[PDB]
């Protein structure tokens, strides 16, 4: 199928520089124009750069002109966004986005989107999380089901990704919005409800990844004897 | 390519 | 620039019913308009292009209409999976484009009481000098729920944080997580840790508790 796989991003200092990448598969990349679209509070969704199928022309809104540069390498099927002179206002999720074929003119719309990269412009330092088990016990069971989870505490900046059993476990998971602690660090919990009956035969591992600090933690969550 | 030419018209 | 204005900002519709979402362009964009559906933390997904042409693989209950400045997205036979924020986008000046500010579609359902669970702090964390106690409220509706932390039956204030999930795409419920965090030294000064939960779906509050010495 068609895919846009985004890499790059994370934390960057005010006035700093950062390059995002997006590799394309499943279609003829050199046939389609691409946009970078960003999303942040207040401003919502807004494009920040556009480039033709061949890279022959680029288009920028006034807000980013002279600071952001879009480019593509159709040999490696990769789209780039070079971000310079970064501003506090530039914190946003940055989406790689594919346009429909220009032969559809005037209907040039966004039919394929990457998964987004969160860029955080801040002078603060990165901090990876501590991951603690939320162990199942008699205090987290009801009606034949048992709740368990992981507490992902004290990281900066967002985001952390949490999966369960390397993605084999998705049903019944709730990974909560992070909270901002008075320290300026984030904390989040991720929980899952499973059968009480199989706690002794099944293995539950939360996989935590904090890409801004390159911290990856797998925590096995064992039942507690209470 | 044919597409590049039309996209240039739109970008300019 | 062309300004896209959506209305309403939010709406709440029962499953099986028909939702009407509006988008107004500040000047005519002919039919050069697209609709996108974005669930939280996911990429927007194209629903309609050309104001009224449904994108491949999109369910028939999504329908776009309009031309010029007034555009409508109609979602019939609404499903819990249709929870999302819906954006319109004009591409009349492509590659220059603008998006509307979004309409958040919330699914109504019947009242559902929370399932309440409590988690004592881990030994890993205690060795670090901190105790976090977590109270979990699973799969309730409506969103409004109150959590009170009681330590040795004393109501707590100022040492907890909570957040609620986005609406669940399968059953339209909410879940809530609340963390009470104390220093290890303060944790060891008390015995009973409890969370008391109030919700429309519960006739009386539900209290989950443990004793620090038992877990």
Residue numbers in the entry:
A (entry chain H): 1 to 226
B (entry chain A): 813 to 824
C (entry chain L): 1 to 215
From the paper:
All five Fabs bind to overlapping epitopes in the fusion peptide through interactions involving the heavy and light chains. (A and B) (Top) Surface representation of the crystal structures of the C77G12 (A) and VN01H1 (B) Fabs in complex with SARS-CoV-2 fusion peptide epitope. Specifically, residues 813SKR815 refold from an extended conformation in prefusion S to an ɑ-helical conformation in the two Fab-bound peptide structures, thereby extending the ɑ-helix found at the N-terminal region of the fusion peptide. The conserved residue R815, which is the S2’ site of proteolytic processing upon receptor binding for membrane fusion activation, is engaged in electrostatic interactions with the C13C9, VN01H1, VP12E7 and C77G12 Fabs and therefore buried at the interface with their paratopes. (D and E) Superimposition of the C77G12-bound (D) or VN01H1-bound (E) fusion peptide structures to prefusion SARS-CoV-2 S uncovering the cryptic nature of the epitope. Furthermore, VN01H1, C77G12 and C28F8 also inhibited SARS-CoV-2 S-mediated cell-cell fusion, suggesting that fusion peptide-specific mAbs could prevent S proteolytic activation or fusogenic rearrangements, thereby inhibiting membrane fusion and viral entry. We next assessed the protective efficacy of the VN01H1 and C77G12 mAbs in vivo. In the Syrian hamster model of SARS-CoV-2 P.1 (Gamma) infection, prophylactic administration of either mAb at high doses reduced viral RNA copies and lung titers, and ameliorated lung pathology at statistically significant levels. We observed that VN01H1 and C77G12 neutralized authentic SARS-CoV-2 Omicron BA.1 and BA.2 more potently than Wuhan-Hu-1, likely due to increased accessibility of the fusion peptide in Omicron S. Furthermore, the neutralization potencies of VN01H1 and C77G12 could be further improved by engineering mAbs with smaller formats (such as scFv), suggesting possible limited accessibility of the fusion peptide region.
The coronavirus spike (S) glycoprotein attaches to host receptors and mediates viral fusion. Using a broad screening approach, we isolated from severe acute respiratory syndrome coronavirus 2 (SARS-CoV-2) immune donors seven monoclonal antibodies (mAbs) that bind to all human-infecting coronavirus S proteins. This class of mAbs recognize the fusion peptide and acquire affinity and breadth through somatic mutations. Structural and functional analyses show that the fusion peptide-specific mAbs bind with different modalities to a cryptic epitope, which is hidden in prefusion stabilized S, and becomes exposed upon binding of angiotensin-converting enzyme 2 (ACE2) or ACE2-mimicking mAbs.
